[PDB]
Design a protein around this ligand. Sequence first.
Ligand code: B12
Ligand code: SF4
Ligand code: SF4
Length: 374
Amino acid sequence: NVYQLKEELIEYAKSIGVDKIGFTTADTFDSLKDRLILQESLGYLSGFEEPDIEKRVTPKLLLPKAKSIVAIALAYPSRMKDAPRSTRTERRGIFCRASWGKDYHDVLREKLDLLEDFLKSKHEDIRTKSMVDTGELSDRAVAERAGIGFSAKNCMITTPEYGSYVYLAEMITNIPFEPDVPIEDMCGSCTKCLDACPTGALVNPGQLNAQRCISFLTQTKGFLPDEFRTKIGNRLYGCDTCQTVCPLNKGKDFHLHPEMEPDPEIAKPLLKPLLAISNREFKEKFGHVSGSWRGKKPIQRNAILALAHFKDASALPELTELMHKDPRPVIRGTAAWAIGKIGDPAYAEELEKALEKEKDEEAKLEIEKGIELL
Ligand code: B12
Ligand code: SF4
Ligand code: SF4
């Protein structure tokens, strides 16, 4: 009976798109509770995590009389088809693979709704609650305890077949499902991702300092610390370095979902046109990816940084214009710093005037940096 519903569940989920499905109890995550406290004690959290730890570790708190959690995983493409090249005159920024195509929040929400629609169709007083959307449980912890994948040294849930290139979601039920078994850790003594990390955010195997992680830094709205401005590179959103360097991700590129296929002109877009994009055009071009949930402001800021990284002298006029005209202190200051970083002394005069007019001390401080660089 219960076993039968489980088999019909697995069978149906694979037919609608789910690449891997797992089962676990609705018991509390004791090891997670301690880790969250420990990570915060060191200040290693990102601030994007859910504040209340109690809700994060107690499945029975979110859903009364719950006895199981069903975890799913969807593999996403790692290689882009017909990707344009970042030429000298036309530099391009890059979005992380976890932001290629349609937002995985919407895709995974659609799959769980069907899975809930499936359980309700049986009409057996079944109660569920999708833990996607927002956002309390630890998707990684649930996945590991449901045999979806093992927690690798780069904090990534790594599947044997699809590697780490998978989106995770789960659904709490009141069904006495029989749990699966956590798979063996296949990292061994390898430490490639730890050394390959540009900022050394992976201070320890399976331990991340999110404050140093580029993936988090690209999503911040304030000024980026100078120690990271030269290490962000051309990344507009997210960072795939500790995944691409991984041997378990070698030869892993699944195109099993058409809506996940990246649009190469927005996945790897030209840097300069992003400097002059409206709110309307941004929501139209990028509003359907995951990397737009903070707005255009952090992305535009990273475009300026990426241009200063490339020293695109042809961007100097537009950078100059943003320094004087843009209503955002973060943009004005970043542009000014970029102008100095590019190293064209002809624009030194225009930095001077802005320094007089600027009232925001942080932006005023950034202008003084660009002046120094010349
Ligand atoms: C906050 C957040 C971030 C933060 C920090 C993530 C982090 N590493 O802690 C930032 C903004 C940096 C980030 C980055 C990324 N993230 Co993110 N992020 C989240 C979010 C909202 C919560 C994660 C969290 O609470 N982390 C806190 C840590 C402490 O716990 P945890 O990693 O979730 O759980 C593990 C640890 O606690 C560990 N742990 C427990 N006990 C112990 C004991 C020891 C000794 C050790 C060493 C570890 C350990 O085991 C748990 C299971 O693996 C989740 C969604 C969700 N609701 O879970 C997505 C999520 C984790 N992120 C995801 C993605 C895709 C990414 C990026 C790859 C995006 C990108 N391309 O840049 C990077 C990866 C960076 C990296 N190397 O880890 C996916 C992961 C998919 C997968 N297959 O695993 C998730 C699950 C979103 C989703 N729904 O699919 N993200
Ligand atoms: S996503 Fe990039 S910055 Fe963050 S831990 Fe991985 S390699 Fe380091
Ligand atoms: S690079 Fe090595 S240590 Fe890092 S996740 Fe891959 S196998 Fe594990």
